[PDB]
Enzyme design. Structure first.
Site, PDB file in Angstrom:
ATOM      1  CG  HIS A 134      -2.391  -1.881   1.263  1.00 47.48           C
ATOM      2  ND1 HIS A 134      -2.718  -1.160   0.153  1.00 47.48           N
ATOM      3  CD2 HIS A 134      -2.175  -2.272   1.805  1.00 47.48           C
ATOM      4  CE1 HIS A 134      -3.107  -2.948   0.663  1.00 47.48           C
ATOM      5  NE2 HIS A 134      -3.330  -2.633   1.848  1.00 47.48           N
ATOM      6  CE1 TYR A 304      -2.397  -8.152   8.936  1.00 47.77           C
ATOM      7  CE2 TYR A 304      -3.843  -8.240   7.606  1.00 47.77           C
ATOM      8  CZ  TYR A 304      -2.483  -7.403   8.155  1.00 47.77           C
ATOM      9  OH  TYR A 304      -2.149  -6.208   7.258  1.00 47.77           O
TER      10      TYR A 304
HETATM   11  C1  LIG Z   1     -14.820  -4.452  17.446  1.00 46.88           C
HETATM   12  C2  LIG Z   1     -14.921  -4.662  15.641  1.00 46.88           C
HETATM   13  N1  LIG Z   1     -13.699  -4.110  14.849  1.00 46.88           N
HETATM   14  C3  LIG Z   1     -12.006  -5.145  15.064  1.00 46.88           C
HETATM   15  C4  LIG Z   1     -10.813  -3.549  16.326  1.00 46.88           C
HETATM   16  C5  LIG Z   1     -13.906  -4.383  13.732  1.00 46.88           C
HETATM   17  C6  LIG Z   1     -12.825  -3.747  12.398  1.00 46.88           C
HETATM   18  C7  LIG Z   1     -13.119  -4.093  10.722  1.00 46.88           C
HETATM   19  C8  LIG Z   1     -12.992  -3.852   9.685  1.00 46.88           C
HETATM   20  C9  LIG Z   1     -12.052  -2.643   9.533  1.00 46.88           C
HETATM   21  C10 LIG Z   1     -11.611  -1.618   9.607  1.00 46.88           C
HETATM   22  C11 LIG Z   1     -10.877  -0.623   9.059  1.00 46.88           C
HETATM   23  C12 LIG Z   1     -10.520   0.066   7.812  1.00 46.88           C
HETATM   24  O1  LIG Z   1      -9.257   0.250   7.449  1.00 46.88           O
HETATM   25  C13 LIG Z   1      -8.377  -0.664   7.210  1.00 46.88           C
HETATM   26  O2  LIG Z   1      -8.968  -1.941   6.909  1.00 46.88           O
HETATM   27  N2  LIG Z   1      -7.394  -0.960   7.144  1.00 46.88           N
HETATM   28  C14 LIG Z   1      -6.277  -2.051   6.750  1.00 46.88           C
HETATM   29  C15 LIG Z   1      -6.518  -3.418   6.817  1.00 46.88           C
HETATM   30  C16 LIG Z   1      -6.011  -4.109   6.553  1.00 46.88           C
HETATM   31  C17 LIG Z   1      -4.811  -4.157   5.425  1.00 46.88           C
HETATM   32  C18 LIG Z   1      -4.020  -5.195   4.955  1.00 46.88           C
HETATM   33  O3  LIG Z   1      -4.157  -6.234   5.273  1.00 46.88           O
HETATM   34  N3  LIG Z   1      -3.179  -4.971   3.496  1.00 46.88           N
HETATM   35  O4  LIG Z   1      -3.061  -5.608   2.976  1.00 46.88           O
HETATM   36  C19 LIG Z   1      -4.663  -2.498   5.159  1.00 46.88           C
HETATM   37  C20 LIG Z   1      -4.858  -1.986   5.944  1.00 46.88           C
HETATM   38  C21 LIG Z   1     -11.107   0.154  10.315  1.00 46.88           C
HETATM   39  C22 LIG Z   1     -11.424  -1.004  11.431  1.00 46.88           C
HETATM   40  C23 LIG Z   1     -11.460  -1.680  11.533  1.00 46.88           C
HETATM   41  C24 LIG Z   1     -13.245  -1.927  12.530  1.00 46.88           C
HETATM   42 ZN   LIG Z   2      -4.269  -7.241   3.361  1.00 51.73          ZN
END
Ligand SMILES: CCN(CC)Cc1ccc2cc(COC(=O)Nc3ccc(C(=O)NO)cc3)ccc2c1
Ligand SMILES: [Zn+2]
Ligand SMILES: [K+]
Ligand SMILES: [K+]
Length: 358
Positions: A134, A304
């Site tokens: 990214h 993850y």
């Molecule tokens: C309590 C429930 N929540 C857990 C904390 C669920 C939850 C689910 C999805 C979420 C998504 C975002 C937006 O942001 C990103 O998804 N970022 C991101 C993720 C993965 C990678 C990567 O693996 N790339 O290869 C890159 C960037 C923010 C918060 C979120 C919270």
């Molecule tokens: Zn990813």
């Protein structure tokens, strides 16, 4: 000469999110991969390759001088300064050791490129964090500081004089950084398969759809395969490789293949929403070894669930080492939604690839 390289350094564990102990991008990701590689007996079958720190000139193949200098300065920042800067980017944290680890993360890939391009090894895998796909010319993004594979591709061209590089990105997210860097470049073919859901899924970009085929001299050399339903399985990925990626790859004739090897599409990932078995990645890795004289370098991106990601790395490694692929229990047929996405991507890329024309 016929060996598989592996790069890992303890520095990859020396940074973490200071303000959110639950952050998914954490040191255990790489520790668990290394522990499983060892207990499976795979680590000892690899050639251990030392990491190195990327240089400024190597970073500048992709990133601006102003951005590199800003990232370098983060090593001396307070936690409050790190948080203020991290908040200027999307989905990023910072830590005083992030820059050092990021430099070794890039350099680990370059070390494997050296060994593979000189035929001192056949292929290799860097077990690196932070991830890279990214990261953008002048921005952090999505847990990434520097674009490991984009730098490695330009490095292979500058140092090793390679003409054509294929980047295959099987992480569940779109590597928009890689797409942007090579948007106008026909010498680096970028293929990404990723969850999309019509933009509902992060990073929510219109340009993650299959209509983004590159521009200028690069028209036809950017290939997006967006999934619009959750729950994709091994047969969906294998079918995509058989119908779309492999025909184009052989036509393109790459001289090096770099894989953005994320494992967030594996069953059990907390974010990816997919149901790909870890063993699928033995097959996908095997399917990429027939081009570029087998010159294949994988670098860790996302993933993850600690066990799922470690299992996916191990499955890929078995194929790098030449072990026969396992049988998969499913037939290999794709679901209707996957076929719809594959057909649409083929429709968008048809004019540029004779191997897709019917
Ligand atoms: C309590 C429930 N929540 C857990 C904390 C669920 C939850 C689910 C999805 C979420 C998504 C975002 C937006 O942001 C990103 O998804 N970022 C991101 C993720 C993965 C990678 C990567 O693996 N790339 O290869 C890159 C960037 C923010 C918060 C979120 C919270
Ligand atoms: Zn990813
Ligand atoms: K991807
Ligand atoms: K391109």
């Amino acid at each position: 000469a016929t060996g598989t390289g592996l790069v890992y350094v303890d520095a990859f564990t020396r940074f973490h999110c200071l303000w959110d102990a639950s952050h998914p991008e954490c040191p255990a990701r790489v520790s668990t991969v290394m522990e499983m590689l060892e207990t499976e007996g795979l680590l000892g079958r690899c050639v251990q390759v030392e990491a190195r720190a990327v240089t400024e000139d190597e970073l500048l193949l992709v990133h601006t001088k102003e951005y590199v200098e800003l990232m370098k300065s983060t090593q001396n920042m307070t936690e409050e300064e790190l948080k203020t800067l991290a908040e200027k980017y999307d989905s990023v944290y910072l830590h005083p050791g992030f820059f050092s680890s990021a430099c070794l993360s890039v350099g680990s890939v370059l070390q494997l490129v050296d060994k593979v391009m000189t035929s001192q090894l056949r292929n290799g895998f860097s077990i690196n964090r932070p991830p890279g796909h990214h990261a953008q010319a002048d921005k952090m993004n999505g847990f990434c500081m520097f674009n490991n594979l984009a730098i490695a591709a330009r490095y292979a061209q500058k140092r090793h004089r390679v003409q054509r590089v294929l980047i295959v990105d099987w992480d569940v997210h779109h590597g928009q950084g890689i797409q942007y860097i090579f948007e106008e470049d026909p010498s680096v073919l970028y293929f990404s398969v990723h969850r999309y859901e019509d933009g509902s899924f992060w990073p929510h970009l219109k340009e993650s759809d299959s209509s983004s085929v590159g521009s200028g001299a690069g028209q036809g050399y950017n290939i997006n395969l967006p999934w619009n339903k959750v729950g994709m399985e091994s047969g969906d990925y294998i079918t995509a490789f058989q119908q779309l990626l492999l025909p184009v790859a052989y036509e393109f004739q790459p001289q090096l293949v770099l894989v953005a090897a994320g494992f967030d599409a594996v069953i059990g990932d907390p974010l990816g929403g997919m149901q790909v078995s870890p063993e699928c990645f033995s097959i996908l890795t095997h399917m990429l070894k027939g081009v570029a004289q087998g010159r294949l370098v994988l670098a860790l991106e996302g993933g993850y669930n600690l066990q799922s990601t470690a299992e996916g790395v191990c499955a890929s490694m078995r194929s790098l080492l030449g072990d026969p692929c396992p049988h998969l229990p499913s037939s290999g047929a794709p679901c209707e939604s996957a076929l719809k996405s594959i057909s649409k991507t083929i429709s968008d890329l048809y004019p540029f690839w004779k191997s897709l024309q019917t």
